[PDB]
From a paper:
Flavodoxins are electron transfer proteins that participate in a variety of reactions in prokaryotes and in some unicellular algae. Either structure shows the archetypical α/β sandwich flavodoxin fold (5 α-helices that pack against a five-stranded β-sheet with a 21345 topology, forming an α/β/α sandwich).
To understand the molecular basis of the interaction of the FMN cofactor with the protein moiety and to provide a structural frame for the identification and characterization of SpFld inhibitors, we have solved the crystal structures of the SpFld in the apo form and in complex with FMN, at 2.18 and 1.69 Å, respectively. Overall, the holo (note that the holo form contains selenomethionine (SeMet) residues) and apo SpFld structures are similar with an r.m.s.d of 0.8 Å. Accommodation of the FMN into the Sp apoprotein takes place with changes in the dihedral angles of several residues of the isoalloxazine binding loops. In the 57–66 loop, the main changes are observed in residues G60, D61, G62 and E63, while in the 92–100 loop they occur in residues D92, Y95 and D96. No significant changes are noticed in the FMN phosphate binding loop, possibly reflecting that the conformation adopted by this loop in the apoprotein is highly influenced by the phosphate anion bound, which mimics the equivalent moiety in the FMN of the holoprotein. As previously reported for the apo/holo flavodoxin pairs in Anabaena PCC7119 and H. pylori, the entrance of the FMN cofactor makes the two isoalloxazine binding loops to move apart. In this reorganization, existing interactions between the two loops in the apoform (Y95/G60 and E97/G62) are broken and the protein expands: the holoprotein surface area is 7745 Å compared to 7135 Å for the apoprotein.
Residue numbers in the entry: 0 to 146
Write the structure that this text describes.
């Protein structure tokens, strides 16, 4: 394939899963091999094997990580991912005044590992509309371009 992308997601009410899937589908159409897994089913260290690492996450309450993301975040923060390209996407809402703060938190943890951000993070309000789909597709196409 063009390269190997590993997308890890957390999703409570399905929006973030759907977003992960949109990104995965464009990457597959561009010729990459892609794995798409819920965060409870993989290890952060599996990222060592990939060329592109992506986290798709919702945000829980007052700007927290998903409960199920806490262990994955810890494991990821302890890795050295020099030479990997990353990106971060997610769904959120404004009810807790911390819209997609988990997306920002995962951007920072990736910076700390030495990986390089390949495209601007994509934050979606609740479910994806076609305008959000376009943004996600441009994100995937920019990562593909960088290889």
């Amino acid at each position: 394939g063009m390269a190997l992308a590993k997308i890890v997601f957390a999703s409570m009410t399905g929006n973030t899963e759907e977003i992960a899937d949109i990104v995965a589908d464009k990457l597959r159409d561009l010729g990459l091999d892609v794995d798409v897994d819920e965060c409870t089913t993989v290890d952060a260290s599996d990222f060592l094997e990939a060329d592109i690492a992506i986290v798709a996450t919702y945000t829980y309450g007052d700007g927290e990580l998903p409960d199920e993301m806490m262990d994955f975040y810890e494991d990821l923060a302890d890795l050295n991912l020099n030479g990997k390209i990353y990106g971060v996407v997610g769904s959120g809402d404004t009810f807790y005044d911390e819209f997609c703060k988990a997306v920002d938190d995962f951007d920072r943890v990736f910076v700390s590992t030495g990986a390089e951000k390949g495209s601007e993070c994509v934050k979606v309000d609740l479910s994806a509309e076609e305008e959000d789909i376009e943004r996600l597709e441009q994100f995937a196409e920019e990562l593909a371009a960088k290889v």
